Design an enzyme around this catalytic site. Structure first.
Site: not given
Length: 242
Positions: A47, A50, A95, A227
């Site tokens: 993602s 994007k 997302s 993350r």
């Protein structure tokens, strides 16, 4: 110009994790990482793709602006937030893969390939399905290559309109207060081993910008919060954020 800082491994070990964090100080033109080898290893973007997909779709007029509505196709999918109407702001925030898969089909193979060559994005290789190559095709990018691409976007130096670059940077806005601003995008690559998580973006301060890219092993979805959490432990240790 690249220094290794092994003390950041403590933040991965204390969270039962393995990965890399890369930082770039814009004023001093210097890089820092806990692991030079993994910092230059290339993976699927998932993602994080994007960001370039949005810029190409705005510049060609496939997307008119950040307020245009993309209607739900009617099909239920496992992620609840996907089962509704979206604009570019909310499609980036949640997302929403199916909205971006439609963008890719309207762009087509020939224009996608030639526009990515212009951005010098990773290995510039789009082999596979035009609507999934970033999830299970031939495109690969490293953490140091994410940083090169993000610095160009920040300074409006990609070969697309300034307006396109300003709209995508607005759609990346994640967090802001009196101390800092974060513009960033998450990713999660699960279709091809090894399964990994990404977070890439920058921290804007009053007098400097710090670019960041991190990836980590993600054998299951229980560690996705790490993350952001491991990246913020490094930023606190370096005194970039309070």
């Amino acid at each position: 110009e690249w220094q290794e800082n092994k003390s950041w491994n403590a933040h991965f070990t204390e969270h039962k994790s393995q990965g890399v964090v890369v930082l770039w100080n814009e004023n001093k033109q210097q890089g820092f990482t806990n692991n030079l080898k993994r910092a230059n290893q290339a993976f699927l973007p998932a993602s994080t793709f994007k960001i370039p997909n949005s810029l190409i779709a705005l510049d060609l007029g496939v997307v008119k602006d950040e307020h245009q509505v993309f209607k739900w196709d009617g099909q239920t999918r496992d992620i609840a937030t996907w089962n509704r109407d979206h604009n570019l702001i909310t499609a980036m925030k949640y997302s929403v893969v199916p909205v971006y898969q439609e963008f890719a089909r309207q762009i087509g193979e020939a224009r996608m390939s030639k526009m990515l060559h212009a951005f010098d994005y990773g290995n510039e290789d789009i082999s596979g399905n035009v609507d999934s190559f970033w999830l299970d095709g031939g495109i690969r990018i490293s953490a140091t290559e994410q940083i090169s691409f993000l610095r160009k976007l920040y300074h409006n130096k990609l070969h697309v309109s300034a307006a396109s670059q300003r709209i995508v940077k607005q759609a990346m806005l994640t967090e802001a207060n009196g101390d800092y601003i974060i513009a960033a995008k998450t990713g999660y690559s699960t279709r091809i081993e090894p399964k990994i998580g990404w977070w890439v973006g920058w921290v804007e301060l009053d007098d400097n910008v710090w670019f960041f890219a991190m990836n980590m092993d993600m054998p299951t979805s229980d560690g996705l919060g790490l993350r952001q959490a491991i990246t913020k432990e490094v930023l606190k240790q370096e005194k970039i954020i309070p």
